[PDB]
């Protein structure tokens, strides 16, 4: 089997502040992506990694434009994971001061997938976005996005600071939009694809179970 991994993180401004009693979603999801990158590193799984640290104070993307596909810096294209990428995640990341949409980054990562997953053989794809739902986004291509996600066999998961079981009306409407989007991907079961961050820690702290085919 083969898989393609494209992790999408935001480096905006809202995550730069949070409750003093809990770590910021920036550093929280930072440890998460660090611990997660470690997971597919040690396992010799042939999964390929690309990273999208959107919400960038600059813009370094193959689809650079004045307003279309803006504020995006793909850390590295879709290839095998390796240590120096983990270290550069640990160091190169910097707190931001901007705010940017994710759906934009979703399409950008989508295009990377379509531009590379046919270029080399794969079997299945994921797309993961970590964010705090503090973006100004339009629901335009959502139907088309979900369409060609279905067509290219790309599975979308969202990871949000709040827990399903006090967030902004911006965050709340983003959450409702996210529920709409996930149901538009799979259906009612799309609720499970919602993920918070503490639960990510609890469910992910272990290293990768050493699976073995008989």
């Amino acid at each position: 089997n083969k898989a393609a991994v494209v992790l999408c993180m935001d480096v905006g401004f809202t995550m730069s502040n949070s409750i003093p009693g809990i770590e910021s979603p920036f550093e929280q999801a930072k440890k998460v992506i660090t611990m997660f990158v470690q997971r597919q590193v040690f396992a010799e799984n042939k999964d390929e990694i690309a990273l999208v640290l959107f919400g960038t104070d600059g813009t370094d993307n193959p689809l650079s434009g004045g307003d279309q596909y803006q504020n995006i810096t793909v850390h590295r294209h879709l290839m095998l994971p390796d240590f120096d990428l983990l270290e550069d995640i640990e160091s190169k990341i910097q707190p931001g001061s901007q705010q940017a949409d994710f759906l934009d980054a979703l399409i950008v990562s989508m295009d990377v997938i379509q531009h590379e997953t046919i270029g080399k053989k794969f079997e299945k794809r994921h797309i993961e976005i970590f964010t705090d739902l503090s973006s100004r986004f339009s629901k335009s291509q959502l139907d088309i996005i979900i369409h060609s996600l279905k067509k290219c066999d790309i599975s979308l998961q969202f990871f949000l600071p709040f827990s399903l079981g006090g967030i902004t009306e911006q965050q709340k409407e983003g959450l409702e939009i996210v529920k709409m989007v996930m149901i538009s991907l799979e259906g009612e079961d799309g609720l499970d694809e919602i993920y918070s961050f503490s639960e990510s820690l609890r469910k992910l702290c272990v290293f990768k179970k050493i699976e073995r085919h008989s």
Partner: peptide
């Protein structure tokens, strides 16, 4: 089943 970030 766990998928993507979990698979």
């Amino acid at each position: 089943k766990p998928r993507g970030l979990f698979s």
